[PDB]
Protein backbone atom coordinates (compact mmCIF):
# COMPACT_ATOMS: atom_id res chain seq x y z
CA UNK A 1 0.00 0.00 0.00
CA UNK A 2 3.02 2.28 0.26
CA UNK A 3 4.87 3.43 3.36
CA UNK A 4 7.16 6.06 4.89
CA UNK A 5 8.85 6.26 8.29
CA UNK A 6 6.09 8.62 9.46
CA UNK A 7 3.63 5.71 9.36
CA UNK A 8 5.66 3.69 11.90
CA UNK A 9 5.68 4.14 15.67
CA UNK A 10 8.55 6.46 16.54
CA UNK A 11 10.15 4.21 19.14
CA UNK A 12 10.10 0.67 17.76
CA UNK A 13 11.05 1.90 14.28
CA UNK A 14 14.45 2.85 15.71
CA UNK A 15 14.65 -0.41 17.68
CA UNK A 16 14.35 -2.23 14.35
CA UNK A 17 16.82 0.07 12.59
CA UNK A 18 19.15 -0.32 15.57
CA UNK A 19 18.89 -4.11 15.33
CA UNK A 20 19.48 -3.76 11.57
CA UNK A 21 22.86 -1.99 11.58
CA UNK A 22 24.11 -4.50 14.16
CA UNK A 23 22.85 -7.34 11.98
CA UNK A 24 24.78 -5.63 9.14
CA UNK A 25 28.15 -4.80 10.70
CA UNK A 26 29.01 -2.00 8.22
CA UNK A 27 29.18 0.54 11.02
CA UNK A 28 32.47 2.41 11.59
CA UNK A 29 32.06 2.58 15.36
CA UNK A 30 34.80 4.97 16.62
CA UNK A 31 36.33 2.75 19.28
CA UNK A 32 36.10 4.96 22.35
CA UNK A 33 32.64 3.44 22.74
CA UNK A 34 31.94 1.78 26.11
CA UNK A 35 34.00 4.59 27.79
CA UNK A 36 32.50 7.84 26.37
CA UNK A 37 29.62 9.43 28.26
CA UNK A 38 27.51 11.04 25.48
CA UNK A 39 27.11 14.28 27.48
CA UNK A 40 28.69 16.16 30.36
CA UNK A 41 25.23 16.10 31.96
CA UNK A 42 25.35 12.34 32.47
CA UNK A 43 26.69 10.32 35.38
CA UNK A 44 27.26 6.93 33.73
CA UNK A 45 27.93 5.86 30.13
CA UNK A 46 25.19 4.07 28.15
CA UNK A 47 24.12 0.73 29.60
CA UNK A 48 24.14 -1.09 26.23
CA UNK A 49 27.95 -1.33 26.12
CA UNK A 50 27.81 -3.06 22.74
CA UNK A 51 25.38 -0.97 20.77
CA UNK A 52 23.74 2.36 21.74
CA UNK A 53 25.66 3.76 18.76
CA UNK A 54 23.51 1.92 16.27
CA UNK A 55 20.60 3.32 18.29
CA UNK A 56 22.07 6.83 18.30
CA UNK A 57 22.91 6.47 14.60
CA UNK A 58 19.43 5.13 13.88
CA UNK A 59 18.00 7.93 16.02
CA UNK A 60 20.19 10.49 14.24
CA UNK A 61 19.27 9.10 10.82
CA UNK A 62 15.54 9.25 11.54
CA UNK A 63 15.78 12.83 12.82
CA UNK A 64 17.61 14.08 9.72
CA UNK A 65 15.03 12.36 7.52
CA UNK A 66 12.15 14.17 9.22
CA UNK A 67 13.42 17.66 8.34
CA UNK A 68 15.42 19.62 5.75
CA UNK A 69 18.86 19.57 7.38
CA UNK A 70 20.37 19.27 10.87
CA UNK A 71 23.80 20.08 12.27
CA UNK A 72 26.31 18.91 14.85
CA UNK A 73 25.23 21.58 17.31
CA UNK A 74 21.62 20.70 16.55
CA UNK A 75 22.14 17.10 17.66
CA UNK A 76 24.14 18.19 20.71
CA UNK A 77 21.12 20.21 21.85
CA UNK A 78 18.55 17.56 20.87
CA UNK A 79 20.01 14.60 22.72
CA UNK A 80 21.14 16.80 25.61
CA UNK A 81 19.40 16.64 28.95
CA UNK A 82 19.32 18.06 32.48
CA UNK A 83 22.62 18.05 34.38
CA UNK A 84 22.37 17.84 38.16
CA UNK A 85 25.01 20.33 39.29
CA UNK A 86 25.34 18.62 42.67
CA UNK A 87 23.90 20.90 45.35
CA UNK A 88 22.96 23.55 42.76
CA UNK A 89 19.89 23.75 40.50
CA UNK A 90 19.60 22.00 37.17
CA UNK A 91 20.42 23.53 33.80
CA UNK A 92 20.19 22.28 30.25
CA UNK A 93 23.53 21.08 28.83
CA UNK A 94 24.50 20.13 25.28
CA UNK A 95 25.70 16.64 24.42
CA UNK A 96 29.03 15.49 22.97
CA UNK A 97 29.86 17.06 19.62
CA UNK A 98 32.13 14.08 18.83
CA UNK A 99 29.69 11.17 19.13
CA UNK A 100 27.21 12.92 16.87
CA UNK A 101 29.77 14.30 14.42
CA UNK A 102 31.18 10.78 14.10
CA UNK A 103 27.64 9.48 13.64
CA UNK A 104 27.20 11.97 10.78
CA UNK A 105 30.44 10.56 9.35
CA UNK A 106 29.83 6.83 9.92
CA UNK A 107 26.34 7.11 8.38
CA UNK A 108 27.51 9.22 5.42
CA UNK A 109 30.34 6.81 4.59
CA UNK A 110 27.64 4.12 4.85
CA UNK A 111 25.31 5.99 2.46
CA UNK A 112 22.37 7.32 4.50
CA UNK A 113 23.11 11.07 4.71
CA UNK A 114 25.01 13.63 2.62
CA UNK A 115 26.62 16.93 3.58
CA UNK A 116 23.84 19.25 2.46
CA UNK A 117 24.20 22.79 1.14
CA UNK A 118 22.89 25.62 3.35
CA UNK A 119 25.05 23.87 5.94
CA UNK A 120 24.08 20.79 7.88
CA UNK A 121 23.30 17.31 6.56
CA UNK A 122 20.51 16.07 4.28
CA UNK A 123 18.94 12.62 4.16
CA UNK A 124 20.48 10.84 1.19
CA UNK A 125 18.09 9.63 -1.50
CA UNK A 126 19.51 6.15 -0.90
CA UNK A 127 18.74 6.71 2.78
CA UNK A 128 15.08 7.31 2.10
CA UNK A 129 15.37 4.11 0.07
CA UNK A 130 16.75 2.16 3.02
CA UNK A 131 14.71 3.98 5.67
CA UNK A 132 11.34 3.42 3.99
CA UNK A 133 12.40 -0.18 3.41
CA UNK A 134 12.90 -1.34 7.01
CA UNK A 135 10.00 0.89 8.04
CA UNK A 136 7.66 -1.26 5.93
CA UNK A 137 9.24 -4.35 7.50
CA UNK A 138 7.96 -3.12 10.86
CA UNK A 139 4.35 -3.10 9.67
CA UNK A 140 4.86 -6.77 8.71
CA UNK A 141 5.27 -7.61 12.41
CA UNK A 142 1.67 -6.43 13.01
CA UNK A 143 0.27 -7.54 9.63
CA UNK B 1 53.60 31.35 57.49
CA UNK B 2 56.44 29.46 59.17
CA UNK B 3 55.00 30.70 62.46
CA UNK B 4 51.41 30.54 61.26
CA UNK B 5 51.28 26.74 61.49
CA UNK B 6 53.66 26.71 64.47
CA UNK B 7 51.39 28.99 66.50
CA UNK B 8 49.43 27.16 69.15
CA UNK B 9 46.18 28.76 70.27
CA UNK B 10 45.39 28.42 66.58
CA UNK B 11 43.08 26.31 64.45
CA UNK B 12 39.60 24.89 64.92
CA UNK B 13 40.54 22.68 67.87
CA UNK B 14 41.39 25.62 70.15
CA UNK B 15 38.36 27.79 69.38
CA UNK B 16 36.05 24.76 69.56
CA UNK B 17 36.99 24.30 73.24
CA UNK B 18 36.27 27.88 74.35
CA UNK B 19 32.92 29.16 75.59
CA UNK B 20 30.73 31.18 73.23
CA UNK B 21 30.55 34.74 74.54
CA UNK B 22 26.99 35.75 75.39
CA UNK B 23 27.33 38.94 73.33
CA UNK B 24 26.62 36.77 70.27
CA UNK B 25 22.96 36.01 71.07
CA UNK B 26 22.07 39.63 71.83
CA UNK B 27 19.25 41.83 70.49
CA UNK B 28 19.03 44.93 68.28
CA UNK B 29 19.79 47.17 71.35
CA UNK B 30 17.70 49.80 69.53
CA UNK B 31 19.42 52.82 71.20
CA UNK B 32 16.73 55.57 71.25
CA UNK B 33 13.76 54.89 68.97
CA UNK B 34 10.93 55.91 71.36
CA UNK B 35 12.32 59.46 71.67
CA UNK B 36 12.03 60.32 67.97
CA UNK B 37 9.49 63.16 68.24
CA UNK B 38 11.32 65.00 71.05
CA UNK B 39 13.77 67.50 69.56
CA UNK B 40 17.19 67.32 71.21
CA UNK B 41 18.29 70.63 69.63
CA UNK B 42 16.50 72.56 72.37
CA UNK B 43 16.05 75.42 69.87
CA UNK B 44 12.36 75.86 68.91
CA UNK B 45 11.67 78.16 65.94
CA UNK B 46 9.72 81.26 66.94
CA UNK B 47 6.32 82.36 65.66
CA UNK B 48 7.66 85.61 64.19
CA UNK B 49 10.34 83.86 62.15
CA UNK B 50 7.68 81.53 60.75
CA UNK B 51 5.31 84.35 59.78
CA UNK B 52 8.22 86.15 58.10
CA UNK B 53 8.98 83.12 55.94
CA UNK B 54 5.53 81.61 55.46
Amino acid sequence: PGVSVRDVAAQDFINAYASFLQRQGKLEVPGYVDIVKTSSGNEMPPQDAEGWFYKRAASVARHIYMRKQVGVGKLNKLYGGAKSRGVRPYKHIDASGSINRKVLQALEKIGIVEISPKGGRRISENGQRDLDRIAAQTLEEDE
Amino acid sequence: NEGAIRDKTAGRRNNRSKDVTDSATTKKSNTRRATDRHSRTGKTDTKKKVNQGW
Binding site: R6, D7, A9, A10, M66 | -
Partner: protein
Protein backbone atom coordinates in the same frame (compact mmCIF):
# COMPACT_ATOMS: atom_id res chain seq x y z
CA UNK C 1 -9.93 23.19 -6.76
CA UNK C 2 -12.01 20.61 -4.89
CA UNK C 3 -14.45 21.26 -2.00
CA UNK C 4 -12.20 22.05 0.95
CA UNK C 5 -12.36 23.99 4.22
CA UNK C 6 -9.80 24.90 6.86
CA UNK C 7 -10.29 25.35 10.61
CA UNK C 8 -8.23 25.54 13.80
CA UNK C 9 -8.29 25.13 17.57
CA UNK C 10 -6.28 26.85 20.30
CA UNK C 11 -5.49 25.52 23.80
CA UNK C 12 -3.63 27.99 25.99
CA UNK C 13 -0.94 28.84 23.47
CA UNK C 14 -1.03 26.11 20.87
CA UNK C 15 -2.89 26.56 17.60
CA UNK C 16 -3.65 23.39 15.64
CA UNK C 17 -4.59 24.17 12.01
CA UNK C 18 -6.55 21.65 9.94
CA UNK C 19 -7.22 21.51 6.19
CA UNK C 20 -10.31 19.44 5.36
CA UNK C 21 -10.65 18.53 1.69
CA UNK C 22 -12.72 15.80 0.06
CA UNK C 23 -10.76 12.55 0.08
CA UNK C 24 -10.70 8.82 0.83
CA UNK C 25 -10.54 9.11 4.61
CA UNK C 26 -7.08 9.88 5.96
CA UNK C 27 -6.28 11.75 9.16
CA UNK C 28 -2.64 12.79 9.52
CA UNK C 29 -1.05 15.06 12.16
CA UNK C 30 2.01 17.05 10.94
CA UNK C 31 3.25 13.99 9.10
CA UNK C 32 1.72 11.00 10.69
CA UNK C 33 -1.53 9.07 11.19
CA UNK C 34 -3.67 9.90 14.20
CA UNK C 35 -2.91 6.35 15.36
CA UNK C 36 0.53 7.45 16.62
CA UNK C 37 0.37 10.83 18.45
CA UNK C 38 1.81 9.41 21.70
CA UNK C 39 1.38 11.20 24.69
CA UNK C 40 -0.59 7.99 24.20
CA UNK C 41 -2.47 8.15 27.47
CA UNK C 42 -4.61 10.77 25.70
CA UNK C 43 -4.75 8.79 22.45
CA UNK C 44 -8.50 8.41 22.88
CA UNK C 45 -8.64 12.15 23.60
CA UNK C 46 -7.95 12.93 19.95
CA UNK C 47 -9.88 9.84 18.81
CA UNK C 48 -12.95 11.24 20.59
CA UNK C 49 -14.32 13.42 17.74
CA UNK C 50 -14.04 10.47 15.36
CA UNK C 51 -16.27 8.46 17.72
CA UNK C 52 -18.76 11.05 18.96
CA UNK C 53 -19.92 11.28 15.34
CA UNK C 54 -19.11 7.76 14.14
CA UNK C 55 -16.23 5.96 12.42
CA UNK C 56 -17.83 6.94 9.09
CA UNK C 57 -18.35 10.61 8.07
CA UNK C 58 -14.65 10.62 7.07
CA UNK C 59 -14.71 8.14 4.14
CA UNK C 60 -15.26 11.10 1.78
CA UNK C 61 -12.86 13.63 3.36
CA UNK C 62 -9.15 14.01 4.11
CA UNK C 63 -7.89 15.87 7.19
CA UNK C 64 -4.34 17.05 7.85
CA UNK C 65 -3.26 18.98 10.94
CA UNK C 66 -0.10 20.87 11.89
CA UNK C 67 0.54 22.15 15.42
CA UNK C 68 3.06 24.80 16.43
CA UNK C 69 3.83 26.14 19.89
CA UNK C 70 2.32 24.90 23.12
CA UNK C 71 3.39 21.80 25.00
CA UNK C 72 3.05 18.03 25.12
CA UNK C 73 -0.56 18.37 26.35
CA UNK C 74 -1.38 21.91 25.17
CA UNK C 75 -1.28 20.69 21.56
CA UNK C 76 -3.26 17.48 22.05
CA UNK C 77 -6.27 19.51 23.18
CA UNK C 78 -5.81 21.71 20.11
CA UNK C 79 -5.80 18.98 17.45
CA UNK C 80 -8.95 17.29 18.75
CA UNK C 81 -10.62 20.72 18.50
CA UNK C 82 -9.35 21.64 15.04
CA UNK C 83 -10.53 18.21 13.85
CA UNK C 84 -14.09 18.55 15.14
CA UNK C 85 -14.39 22.23 14.22
CA UNK C 86 -13.56 21.28 10.63
CA UNK C 87 -15.84 18.29 10.26
CA UNK C 88 -18.59 20.67 11.41
CA UNK C 89 -17.35 23.37 9.04
CA UNK C 90 -17.26 20.98 6.08
CA UNK C 91 -20.99 20.38 6.50
CA UNK C 92 -21.38 24.17 6.72
CA UNK C 93 -20.70 24.78 3.03
CA UNK C 94 -20.94 21.37 1.30
CA UNK C 95 -23.62 19.33 3.09
CA UNK C 96 -27.00 20.49 4.39
CA UNK C 97 -27.45 22.56 7.54
CA UNK C 98 -29.59 20.13 9.53
CA UNK C 99 -26.84 17.52 9.29
CA UNK C 100 -24.31 20.11 10.47
CA UNK C 101 -26.62 21.03 13.36
CA UNK C 102 -26.81 17.33 14.26
CA UNK C 103 -23.00 17.32 14.58
CA UNK C 104 -22.66 20.32 16.90
CA UNK C 105 -25.47 18.76 18.95
CA UNK C 106 -23.72 15.38 19.25
CA UNK C 107 -20.41 17.16 19.99
CA UNK C 108 -21.38 19.78 22.58
CA UNK C 109 -23.49 17.20 24.43
CA UNK C 110 -20.18 15.59 25.48
CA UNK C 111 -17.77 18.44 24.68
CA UNK C 112 -14.45 18.34 26.32
CA UNK C 113 -14.35 21.84 24.69
CA UNK C 114 -14.48 20.46 21.16
CA UNK C 115 -15.82 23.37 19.10
CA UNK C 116 -15.45 25.97 21.86
CA UNK C 117 -11.92 27.27 22.52
CA UNK C 118 -11.00 27.50 26.20
CA UNK C 119 -10.33 31.03 27.42
CA UNK C 120 -7.97 30.16 30.32
CA UNK C 121 -4.56 31.82 30.11
CA UNK C 122 -1.39 32.20 32.21
CA UNK C 123 -1.74 35.20 34.55
CA UNK C 124 1.14 37.72 34.81
CA UNK C 125 3.54 37.49 37.74
CA UNK C 126 3.60 40.55 39.96
CA UNK C 127 6.75 41.68 41.73
CA UNK C 128 6.94 40.51 45.33
CA UNK C 129 6.81 36.76 44.71
CA UNK C 130 7.98 34.00 42.41
CA UNK C 131 4.44 33.42 41.12
CA UNK C 132 1.24 35.16 40.05
CA UNK C 133 -0.51 35.19 43.42
CA UNK C 134 2.31 33.56 45.40
CA UNK C 135 4.20 36.01 47.62
CA UNK C 136 7.68 35.68 49.05
CA UNK C 137 8.28 34.60 52.65
CA UNK C 138 8.42 37.19 55.43
CA UNK C 139 9.69 36.69 58.96
CA UNK C 140 8.59 39.71 61.11
CA UNK C 141 12.12 39.68 62.74
Amino acid sequence: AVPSVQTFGKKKSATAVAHVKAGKGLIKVNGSPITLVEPEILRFKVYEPLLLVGLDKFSNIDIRVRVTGGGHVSQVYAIRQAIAKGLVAYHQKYVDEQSKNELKKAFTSYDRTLLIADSRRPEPKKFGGKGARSRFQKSYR
